Design a protein around this ligand. Structure first.
Ligand SMILES: Nc1ncnc2c1ncn2[C@@H]1O[C@H](COP(=O)(O)OP(=O)(O)O)[C@@H](O)[C@H]1O
Ligand SMILES: Nc1ncnc2c1ncn2[C@@H]1O[C@H](COP(=O)(O)OP(=O)(O)O)[C@@H](O)[C@H]1O
Ligand SMILES: [Mg+2]
Ligand SMILES: [Mg+2]
Lengths: 7, 414, 371, 283, 7
């Protein structure tokens, strides 16, 4: 992901 | 009708020479170089400064041995070179007289030991680009050339890139593994002992164990090693007592010819038939600093690389190099490696029980031709590849960036 | 004459023709590059060995997964894998046939728009579509009502469904998946005495888990029986010949699915999430959802998982009805089978998205196409 | 080496290695090697077919067409006897040795084969000298440009012969060095008594080359050697031919030798500079 | 170590 978690 | 490039394998010992796209190195000559030096005393502020044309008044090659008024001075010493002016003189002499190749319209590939410092490569490349004006240049380690030459042993069509090579040399023998074209940089070790100090030990022992030879013709006497005169020995003391017990049939004799008075001189052959070649697995005899065997070094270097590559590597060990010509070398190395690896496997299995039985690790040593020279064919295939003409560093690259283009090394990176 | 269905799985890629009952190309999503100097110049060197080969020569490459937890991170790697699968393996030009793509629910719209734009621009495919793995799982299972447990390698999600309609407001997506299980397995294998760090040993541990892992009906009882460790330990043969003995780790890592607190995630297990999702649905459809529970994905092949899930759901749910778990033995490729069946449907021949309408409208069209 | 040799020692060495074991039974020793020498010409040694009893040598002369047009019937029987056969590789002279027949001589034949390039090159110069010697009407001047972009021209009139050289230098580094080298060529005469006149010209090409389409440009020098019978008779012909043919590589090699000489001198001076510097460190 | 690395 972009915010929260990686991906 | 494109001109072939030029293949050269410089080194401390007999320098190989010839052209690409050929199946035999035409010229194989020592590194001996003559010079018109004599006895001046001012030798550290004018080494030579030969007046007039006397600077080039020097021979080269096998013809340079039989000139008893100059100085035979080897420029190379186990890779590292102190003064490279002699190297440049030798290079010009060879390219012109022997090769007869115009540098401005030819490509030169050169080989150096892996331990060669970046400075030497940079400055030799600068010298080449400045004087010879060679359009292209390329320098690479000799291990891959040996691996490529090893394909001729059997099943050339069967591509086999993995393996490892332990090459010999007049002053260096190195260990380098290959993992499907890509070698490991950190898993390389340099061995100082080589096929020269062995002869030093042979002559040192002979000068006391026997008499009847002249001081001048010593090395020719010490070259019984290159003959059938050295066999390796699974055991040391056993053969020692074998000789000290019978000492009649196992002893050989020498019938060399003097090069001055043409008077025959003979000496017997003793314990040196095996001790010399045995020094490889017991380097402590000659070099006190390096008290470390070879086979265990091989297993250690093969055990410092990823798991997936350990298995195929042990299966492919190439017998290439002059110092490896000794008989039964492969048997000893294979047996030692098998013993140590089996012991390691048994120790690993002991700690964790199980009724299983892992398939035994297979270690095989391959004996083939090309052992004396395994770098020349690699260079020939290097030149024959069109991609070589594209990877080779160009003139403009050296024009302003400098000779740093040749500074690439396989054990460096930032 | 036919269409191609490609499933960009978080850890594996499935592709094949529309109509076949089995995929024609099954290789993991690996895009590896050499780590060493690039020294050799003879016979075969390539700048980026990405694909099936990568697994064979993984010992000198820095393997990196292009897709992470269902969301693409490197577009160059994904385009490279797409090109490889289309040309080297399938050997079918994109123009000849259309392509079908699937993705997990609750994914960012940016990924969908970029994928559609790249597919329409680079390969100029005549038409394509975007769907959901769970609905294709339903199609493969030949059922119209149930709850999907799509526990893939990167994402686990559920989507309640009813006859002829879905419930988009009761969709739960959990980031926990096979990769986290592999990381935890590596961590515990470290506590045993065996160390594994690089990606090659990551693949080795993945294989080990695939071969010697199972779920435990009761955690405490299994731990006690492990205290009497004389019948549970098993041995595995490494490529180098070393033998590794695995005991409690066989039934410890799978329990992370039911106990996310092991990794430190403040969430709930798959059973709790499914219970919450079903409860959020209408009362009447709860009976049907309980009576039908479809599961799919490569993370749900552990023996005994179905029994444990059934026991947990029955314990949580009221003990007055019957709960049934359906575990087909081909759940690995259920998504691909469903995609193929959907493509074969006559009515779907018009739902595709063609180049003309895409160009005139824009990338936003796919957003309104079946959500 | 000071005077560049004309005998390629590669053929000498390989033929010596082959013949020293010739009297050892049915010993084929299949050979296939490609070489290269000055003037940008490629050699080739390879058996004609599976029959290894015959070894063949060939050339890839750049200006071969001029030689064929002129006709070298003299060279087909004087130096080379019956062991010369029609060209195979690229329409260029190729010879072979018949091993089945006994080879009586060992050194003479090897030496004769060693000078193949000059042996074929002489076919034009010696014939022009014969034309001017025989009293035949002065044969038409000819221009012979070899692999190098430069050109060679010769005029054979009565009472004397002429030769002019065109020089081209590729790298900018060596242009000035070669200019300096050839500047003093036209003047050094205090140690030669029976030697020809020498002159250098770069700005103004000689009037002889105006009509001829020889090397014409801006950064091209010219060298002419005047020829007279006192140094072009039957006795001093081979030496002059060898000197002129080996002129180009001679200049090149001595340029490199001068470069090495200056390198050595500067290396020597560095020691003096360091000695001067060492005055700064304390006792 | 026992497996992986030496220690
Ligand atoms: N048949 C042989 N028996 C024993 N030693 C040999 C034999 N051939 C070569 N050698 C030794 O190996 C050395 C040459 O190996 P080589 O690698 O070709 O030198 P370099 O390192 O310059 O390439 C020689 O010093 C020689 O003593
Ligand atoms: N036989 C197996 N046993 C346990 N896990 C498996 C097995 N086969 C695959 N897996 C796991 O399931 C994953 C396969 O990817 P997958 O679950 O199908 O994600 P997706 O559903 O998006 O294709 C792998 O990460 C692997 O860890
Ligand atoms: Mg060597
Ligand atoms: Mg999935």
């Amino acid at each position: 992901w972009x915010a929260x978690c990686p991906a | 009708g494109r001109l072939p490039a030029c293949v050269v394998d410089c080194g401390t010992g007999y320098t190989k020479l010839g052209y690409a796209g050929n199946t035999e190195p035409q010229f194989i000559i020592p590194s001996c170089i003559a010079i018109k030096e004599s006895a001046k005393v001012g030798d550290q502020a004018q080494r030579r400064v030969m007046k007039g044309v006397d600077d080039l008044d020097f021979f080269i090659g096998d013809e340079a041995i039989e000139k008893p008024t100059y100085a035979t001075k080897w420029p190379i010493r186990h890779g590292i070179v102190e003064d490279w002016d002699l190297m440049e003189r030798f290079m010009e002499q060879v390219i012109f007289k022997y090769l007869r190749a115009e540098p401005e319209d030819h490509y030169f590939l050169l080989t150096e030991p892996p331990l060669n410092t970046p400075e030497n490569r940079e400055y030799t490349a600068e010298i080449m680009f400045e004087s010879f004006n060679v359009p292209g240049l390329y320098i690479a380690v000799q291990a891959v050339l040996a691996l490529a030459a090893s394909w001729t042993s059997r099943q050339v069509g069967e591509r086999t890139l993995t393996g490892t090579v332990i090459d010999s040399g007049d002053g260096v023998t190195h260990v380098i593994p290959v993992a499907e074209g890509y070698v490991i940089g950190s898993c390389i070790k340099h061995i100082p002992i080589a096929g020269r100090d062995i002869t030093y030990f042979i002559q040192q022992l002979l000068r006391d164990r026997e008499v009847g030879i002249p001081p001048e013709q010593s090395l020719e006497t010490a070259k019984a090693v290159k003959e059938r005169y050295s066999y390796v020995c699974p055991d040391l003391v056993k053969e020692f007592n074998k000789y000290d017990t019978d000492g009649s049939k196992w002893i050989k004799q020498y019938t060399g010819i003097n090069a001055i008075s043409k008077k025959e001189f003979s000496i017997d052959v003793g314990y040196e038939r095996f001790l010399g070649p045995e020094i490889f697995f017991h380097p402590e005899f000659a070099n006190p600093d390096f008290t470390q065997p070879i086979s265990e070094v091989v297993d250690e270097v093969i055990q410092n690389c990823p798991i997936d590559v350990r298995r195929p590597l042990y299966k492919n060990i190439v017998l290439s190099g002059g110092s490896t010509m000794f008989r039964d070398f492969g048997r000893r190395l294979q047996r030692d490696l098998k013993r140590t690896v089996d012991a390691r496997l048994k120790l690993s299995e002991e700690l964790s029980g199980g009724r299983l039985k892992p398939k035994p690790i297979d270690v095989q040593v391959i004996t083939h031709h090309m052992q004396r020279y395994a770098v020349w064919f690699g260079g020939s295939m290097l030149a024959s590849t069109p991609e070589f003409y594209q990877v080779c560093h160009t003139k403009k690259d050296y024009e302003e960036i400098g000779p740093s283009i040749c500074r690439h090394n396989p054990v460096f990176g930032v | 004459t036919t269409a191609l269905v490609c499933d960009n799985g978080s850890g594996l890629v499935k592709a094949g023709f529309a109509g076949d009952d089995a995929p024609r190309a099954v290789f993991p999503s690996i895009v590896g590059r050499p780590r060493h100097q690039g020294v050799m110049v003879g016979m075969g060197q390539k700048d980026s060995y990405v694909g099936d080969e990568a697994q064979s020569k993984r010992g000198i490459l820095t393997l990196k997964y292009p897709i992470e937890h269902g969301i693409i991170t490197n577009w160059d790697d994904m385009e490279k894998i797409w090109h490889h699968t289309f040309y080297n393996e399938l050997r079918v030009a994109p123009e000849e046939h259309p392509t079908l793509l699937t993705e997990a629910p609750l994914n960012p719209k940016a990924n969908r728009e970029k994928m559609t734009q790249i597919m329409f621009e680079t390969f100029n495919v005549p038409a394509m579509y975007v769907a959901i793995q769970a609905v294709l799982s339903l199609y493969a299972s030949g059922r119209t009502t149930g709850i999907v447990l799509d526990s893939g390698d990167g994402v686990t999600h559920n989507v309640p469904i009813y006859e002829g309609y879905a419930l988009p407001h009761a969709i739960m997506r959990l980031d926990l998946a096979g990769r986290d299980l592999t990381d935890y397995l590596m961590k515990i294998l470290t506590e045993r005495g065996y160390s594994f760090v690089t990606t090659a040993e990551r693949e080795i541990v993945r294989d080990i888990k695939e071969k010697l892992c199972y779920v435990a009906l009761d955690f405490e009882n299994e731990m006690a029986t492990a205290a009497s460790s004389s019948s549970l330990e098993k041995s595995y043969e490494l490529p180098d010949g070393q033998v590794i003995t695995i005991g409690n780790e066989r039934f410890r890592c799978p329990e992370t699915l039911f106990q996310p607190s092991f990794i430190g995630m403040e969430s709930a297990g798959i059973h709790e999430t499914t219970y919450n999702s079903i409860m959020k649905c209408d009362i009447d459809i709860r009976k049907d959802l309980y009576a039908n529970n479809v599961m799919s994905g490569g993370t749900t092949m552990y023996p005994g998982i179905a029994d444990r899930m059934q026991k947990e759901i029955t314990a949580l749910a009221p003990s007055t009805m019957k709960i049934k778990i359906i575990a087909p033995p081909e759940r690995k490729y259920s998504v691909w089978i469903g995609g193929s069946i959907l493509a074969s449907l006559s009515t779907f021949q018009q739902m595709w998205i063609t180049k003309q309408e895409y160009d005139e409208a824009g990338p936003s069209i796919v957003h309104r196409k079946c959500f | 080496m000071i005077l560049l040799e004309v005998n390629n020692r590669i053929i000498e060495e390989t033929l010596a290695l082959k013949f020293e074991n010739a009297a050892a039974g049915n010993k084929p020793e299949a050979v296939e090697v490609t070489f290269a020498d000055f003037d940008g010409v490629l050699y080739h040694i390879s058996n004609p077919n599976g029959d290894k009893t015959k070894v063949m040598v060939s050339i890839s002369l750049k200006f071969y067409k001029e030689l064929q047009a002129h006709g070298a019937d003299e060279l087909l029987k004087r130096v080379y006897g019956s062991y010369l056969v029609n060209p195979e590789s690229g329409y260029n002279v190729s010879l072979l040795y018949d091993l089945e027949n006994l080879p009586a001589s060992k050194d003479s034949i090897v030496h004769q084969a060693g000078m193949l390039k000059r042996n074929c090159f002489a076919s034009v110069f010696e014939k022009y000298f014969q034309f001017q010697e025989e009293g035949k009407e002065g044969e038409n001047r000819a221009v012979i440009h070899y692999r190098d972009d430069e050109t060679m021209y010769v005029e054979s009139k009565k009472d004397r012969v002429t030769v002019v050289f065109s020089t081209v230098f590729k790298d900018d580094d060596d242009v000035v060095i070669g200019k300096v080298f050839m500047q003093e060529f036209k003047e050094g005469r205090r140690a030669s008594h029976t030697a020809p006149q020498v002159l250098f010209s770069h700005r103004e090409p000689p009037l002889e080359l105006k009509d001829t389409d020889a090397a014409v440009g801006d950064n091209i020098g010219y060298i002419t050697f005047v020829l007279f019978p006192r140094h072009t008779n039957a006795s001093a012909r081979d030496n002059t031919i060898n000197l002129i043919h080996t002129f180009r590589d001679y200049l090149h090699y001595h340029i490199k030798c001068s470069k090495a000489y200056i390198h050595t001198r500067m290396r020597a001076k560095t020691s003096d500079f360091l000695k001067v510097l060492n005055r700064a460190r304390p006792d």
